[PDB]
């Protein structure tokens, strides 16, 4: 306008409805948020509805809804066992891990520095993507970025041309091991494809659950032993 100064002093702007709505209280609220897993996608008239991850026909999860631990554990709740329940707390809404490939074919591996250090005079950063014999780890196994694979084939087979990488082998293997991610020893990367690892862990933690149970049942045995040994 031209001359709005009078009533433009108390202008009544618009209210934050987007914020109000986003900050309403939701019947689906979660203490710790988790992005739901992918649904089955119709793969053709030959293949029907299959998920992509391994071909599941459902949505991999453990608990969907806000109640399904409470509803499962109702009578405990009405006798009052679920006031202190930490078994209804830690695992009220535990959803499965990102059991997938965030970037499957490996577009994000390696890290940008590694390219610039992937040249011919760089057997050090070459040999951190080749097998202990110089073999590339196959694309199904170590999914590399295509540019990485190109720079790497030419970098290895140029270093080998000028004789600055062994025509066979991996001279930087143990030094390279620090960069290569030691995974199946202690830490459990839930997105591993080794299932021996997952079974070690399921055992070891089932070992420990059985260990609680063992310790306390033998303590109760000891108690009933001390009964007759102390009173009679």
């Amino acid at each position: 306008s031209v001359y709005a100064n009078a009533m433009a002093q108390f202008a009544i702007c618009r209210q934050p409805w987007n914020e109000y709505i986003n900050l309403l209280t939701k019947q689906d609220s979660t203490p710790y948020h988790v992005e739901p897993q992918e649904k089955p996608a119709y793969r053709g008239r030959k293949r029907g509805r299959e998920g992509w991850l391994f071909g599941q026909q459902v949505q991999l999860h453990y608990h969907r809804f806000p109640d399904e631990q409470l509803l499962t554990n109702l009578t405990r709740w009405r006798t009052g066992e679920t006031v202190g329940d930490i078994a209804l707390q830690q695992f009220r809404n535990a959803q499965p891990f990102d059991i997938e490939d965030k970037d499957p074919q490996g577009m994000q591996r390696p890290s940008p520095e590694v390219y610039m250090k992937l040249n011919y005079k760089n057997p050090a950063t070459i040999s951190r993507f080749l097998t202990r014999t110089g073999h590339m780890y196959p694309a199904d196994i170590l999914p590399l970025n295509p540019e990485a694979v190109a720079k790497l084939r030419v970098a290895k087979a140029q270093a080998v041309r000028i004789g600055l990488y062994p025509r066979f082998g991996n001279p930087f293997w143990f030094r390279s091991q620090k960069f290569r991610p030691k995974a199946y020893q202690e830490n459990y990367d839930p997105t591993t494809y080794s299932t021996k690892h997952t079974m070690e862990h399921f055992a070891y933690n089932w070992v420990q659950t059985d260990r609680i149970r063992r310790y306390f049942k033998e303590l109760e045995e000891l108690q009933k032993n001390a009964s007759n040994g102390a009173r009679g």
Partner: protein
Amino acid sequence: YVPAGHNTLSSLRHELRLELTAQSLKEAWMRISGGIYFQSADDYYASVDGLDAEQLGEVLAALFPYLSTYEAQALVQCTLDSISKPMNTASRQLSRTITAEAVGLDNAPGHYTNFLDWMGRLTETRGFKTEHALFQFSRRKFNRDDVRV
């Protein structure tokens, strides 16, 4: 997520706390009784073999005198129930029913906690144990003697 206020690396050599919690009672008892744990009040009572409820109610009305009569018994039951699983008895159950009933329709939007309580109310009826029996019958957890009885 590790729940709130629940300490993980808490030991027994870790000094005792002060909060009247089920976890606190259970760990203090782990220090105290060495290894006794009861699946309810009545495992402890089958261990004590003839100590009734009043037989500890009077003990504690004495032990701490500013408590009233039934309140001594209540401390009894509560320490039991807190180092155990809470008990299934017509006493507690009529407490719950009379109380929720005097409480009335609630302020959760869809009478939600009322429906939680009523889905509890009929979960401890005979009809529930009747149908639980019928369901188990459909599963054959029994034997010839059961059939005959």
